[PDB]
From a paper:
Scribble (Scrib) is a multidomain polarity protein and member of the leucine-rich repeat and PDZ domain (LAP) protein family.
We examined the structural basis of this putative binding interface by determining the crystal structure of the isolated Scrib PDZ1 domain in complex with an 8-mer peptide representing the C-terminal region of TMIGD1 which includes the PBM (-DPHSETALCOOH, PBM underlined). The PDZ1:TMIGD1 structure was refined to a resolution of 1.9 Å with a final Rfree of 0.222. The TMIGD1 peptide engaged with the PDZ1 domain via the well-conserved canonical ligand binding groove located between the β2 strand and the α2 helix. The C-terminal carboxyl group of the TMIGD1 peptide docks in the conserved hydrophobic pocket of PDZ1, interacting with the main chain L738PDZ1, G739PDZ1 and I740PDZ1. Furthermore, a network of hydrogen bonds is observed between PDZ1 and TMIGD1 including interactions mediated by PDZ domain side chains (H793PDZ1:T260TMIGD1, S748PDZ1:S258TMIGD1, T749PDZ1:D255TMIGD1) and interactions mediated by the PDZ domain main chain (I742PDZ1:A261TMIGD1, I742PDZ1:T260TMIGD1, G744PDZ1:S258TMIGD1, T749PDZ1:P256TMIGD1). Lastly, a salt bridge is found between R762PDZ1 and E259TMIGD1.
Author numbering:
A (entry chain B), C (entry chain B): 715 to 816
B (entry chain A), D (entry chain A): 50 to 57
Write the structure that this text describes.
């Protein structure tokens, strides 16, 4: 009989995106007062990642939950507040994300 | 609620 | 200049230990009402792992926080309750643990 | 508080 191998169930990661003239190469979805991206969770989620763009190359994945950006915590953020946090984050965009096994 | 998505 | 690579900060894992006649090859520490293993956290922690024992081979590491064992949640457990949960867990001991970067 | 450790 087979034994289940070790399995990572969820993870928090610090990822550092180097912004290009085209942006970060992500879309975000969700936010306080918006329709939840997932379940009933009103957090900020990565809904799209541009193939081979800055975010992809930094290791961002669709479905990642964005927790903080360059020391700004996103707990309780409305959508536009997260947009503002990312838009204004400069050339290196360091993000803490939560990720679960798919 | 509104469904919000933003490309960045 | 160097950019920080992607970094895993913390993780939850499901690990499955196949018990041997010698036991699981771990020690645990902590528990509600006991001195915290780490910080002020009164949870149940892996304080020792026997080299090449069952737990080591399953991927358990010192400092892992034990969250559940074969569907028994350890939140709020006193030390002896966690001992009992592990002692009585049978031949395959499936554990959910929390682990942080060291 | 007591310092508790158990080998298993």
């Amino acid at each position: 009989l087979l034994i289940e191998p070790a399995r990572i169930e969820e993870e928090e990661l610090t990822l550092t995106i180097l912004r290009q003239t085209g942006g970060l190469g992500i879309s975000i979805a969700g936010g306080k007062g918006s329709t939840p991206y997932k379940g009933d969770d009103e957090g900020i989620f990565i809904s799209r990642v541009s193939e081979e763009g800055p975010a992809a190359r930094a290791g961002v994945r669709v479905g990642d939950k964005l927790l903080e950006v360059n020391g700004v915590a996103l707990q309780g953020a409305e959508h536009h507040e997260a947009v503002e946090a990312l838009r204004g984050a400069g050339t290196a965009v360091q993000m803490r994300v939560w990720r679960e096994r798919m | 609620d509104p469904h919000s998505e933003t490309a960045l």
